[PDB]
Amino acid sequence: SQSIIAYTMSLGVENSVAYSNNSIAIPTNFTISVTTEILPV
Amino acid sequence: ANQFNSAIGKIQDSLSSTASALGKLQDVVNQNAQALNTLVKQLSSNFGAISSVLNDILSRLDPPEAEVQIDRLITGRLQSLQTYVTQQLIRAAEIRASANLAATKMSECVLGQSKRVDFCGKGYHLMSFPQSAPHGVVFLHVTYVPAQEKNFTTAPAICHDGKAHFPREGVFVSNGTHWFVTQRNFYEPQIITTDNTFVSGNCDVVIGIVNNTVYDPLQPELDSFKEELDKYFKNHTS
Amino acid sequence: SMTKTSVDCTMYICGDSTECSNLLLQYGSFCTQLNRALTGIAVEQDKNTQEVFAQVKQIYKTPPIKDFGGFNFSQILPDPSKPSKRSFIEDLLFNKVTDLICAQKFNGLTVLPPLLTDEMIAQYTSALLAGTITSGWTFGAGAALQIPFAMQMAYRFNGIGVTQNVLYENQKLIANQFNSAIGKIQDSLSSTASALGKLQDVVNQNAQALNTLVKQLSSNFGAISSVLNDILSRLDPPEAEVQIDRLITGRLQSLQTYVTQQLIRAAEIRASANLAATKMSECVLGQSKRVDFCGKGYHLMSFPQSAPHGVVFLHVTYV
Amino acid sequence: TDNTFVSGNCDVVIGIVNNTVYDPLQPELDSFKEELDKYFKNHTS
Secondary structure (H helix, E strand, C coil): CCCCCCCCCCCCEECCCCCCCCEEEEECCEEEEEEEEEEEC | CHHHHHHHHHHHHHHHHCCCCCHHHHHHHHHHHHHHHHHHHHHHCCCCCCCCCHHHHHCCCCHHHHHHHHHHHHHHHHHHHHHHHHHHHHHHHHHHHHHHHHHHHHHHHHHCCCCCCCCCCCCEEEEEEEEEECCEEEEEEEEEEECCEEEEECCCCEECCCCEEEECCCEEEECCCCEEEECCCCCCCEECECCCEEECCCCCCCCCCEECCCECCHHHHHHHHHHHHHHHHHHHCC | CCCEEEECHHHHHCCCCHHHHHHHHHHCCHHHHHHHHHHHHHHHHHHHHHHHCCCCCEECCCCCCCCCCCCCCCCCCCCCCCCCCCCHHHHHHHHCCCCHHHHHHCCCEEEECCCCCHHHHHHHHHHHHHHHHHHCCHHHHCCCCCCCHHHHHHHHHHHCCCCCHHHHHHHHHHHHHHHHHHHHHHHHHHHCCCCCHHHHHHHHHHHHHHHHHHHHHHCCCCCCCCCHHHHHHHCCHHHHHHHHHHHHHHHHHHHHHHHHHHHHHHHHHHHHHHHHHHHHHHHHHCCCCCCCCCCCCEEEEEEEEEECCEEEEEEEEEC | CCCCCCCCCCCCCCCCCCCCCCCCHHHHHHHHHHHHHHHHHHHHC
């Protein structure tokens, strides 16, 4: 029971970052990410 | 150690399971395959002549009639060959532009360390590992990305003796009790000291300055001497 | 990006002709190579919009209570009260860049609509603007870190060699210098309409190429008449195949000439798109110390703006 | 001394000029020495 559907392009998840004068955010942790790029020569 | 080794294992799993990540190189093979096939298939076209076979035109029509029909065949083929060469010159400009970008990332990301954003990949660049690829090259980029974050209370300066104390390295953070100094890239709370800050201007020229006590590491050590030296001076009089 | 065009080989060379359609079979795949070349251009036009306009997949918004420390961003930020989402500067950027479309579509020249609408372009711009304002340099290299904008200028000055003490003391002076400089941008773009001429040359290049491609049809190319119905109604079918072939060869070279010029202009627009994609990441998201890249002087911040068939960068430097 | 650092000598550097480098510990300790002189006179008094 599946078919082709049409829809408007989504622009991505909307996330409103809080903003204040006396407020700040500092990372408490981190991570090591590895990415792959393929460039023809 | 467990973050990098597991990440390389993800690269091995993503490369083995997904074979379409190299499609950028497969497009090069496809563009050449379509170009080599198109050039040879145009030889069977009549190009406005009676027949595409040159042996049939020469062995049938008269020399005055054959030179006309073969002329349409040769001219039509030259236009197809010039079209092939023109398309190869266009793909040549595209492959040389990608080669200059590969030579740039090889130098900055691999040989050295580049601070450019979205050049060596998402995040703060650390190291890049090149890998051999057919008709191309593969770059393995290791980057530094933050994970967990927490909201803190900040302030542009600390007011102690009446002059603003600006942080030497890092920013001011507090949990609502005592003000701490930590770097922007990671959270390592430290006590505010004269070595971690520097005195510039006064407390009035700073907008939003807060009052606190800057710890002087020489204050308790010098006061301990005033206690000891007076105990010595008291023994000098006895 | 450039105007996406799709030209049919049949209707451009000889339309509504069955006898000529059989004469085209003798020239082989010429339609396939000319159609895939024009199709590949239209695909690359949408790839330039994904690599430049939208840098990140996360949409950032502006908080309702605005205290920026004395800077006025109302001109660079979009106005929600307007029916179409745009800023005060983008209002001029769209108006200063200029039916010929329907007239060319009658001869077989199809104008393909772009995948990325201008309204979605303004959202990617507003997402990068609201992110640079609130998140500073953090959203580009990872998760967005909340930082007050007053402390963001302190780090941007420390990067060019300026101690942050200059910021807190000159905070009122810098507030007047920035707000007055942004006001000069709207006044310069309103009075001078030739500042966008780099984009107008792209529209003029497509207009001259499409119009000249149609003007080639009026030429007889050494034949008796350029009209197909004339040759069929005048010369016998055996004699008509000679005159029609004269129109085929000429219009084929005229169509291959247009495709060749568009493939050359496609390489120039992708080179400018890669430069725009580089400045979008280094100047806007982060802070680049490169000279004469993010603009003359010591770079501080960069504000992207939406423009027809392009993008406008607002660079703030320390002079 | 906190804004500068010691490298080489005055003879090697070409164009060096003579001046006094203010050490913030000198007046704090010299005044601390004067207090000790006042403290020692207080124990004798």
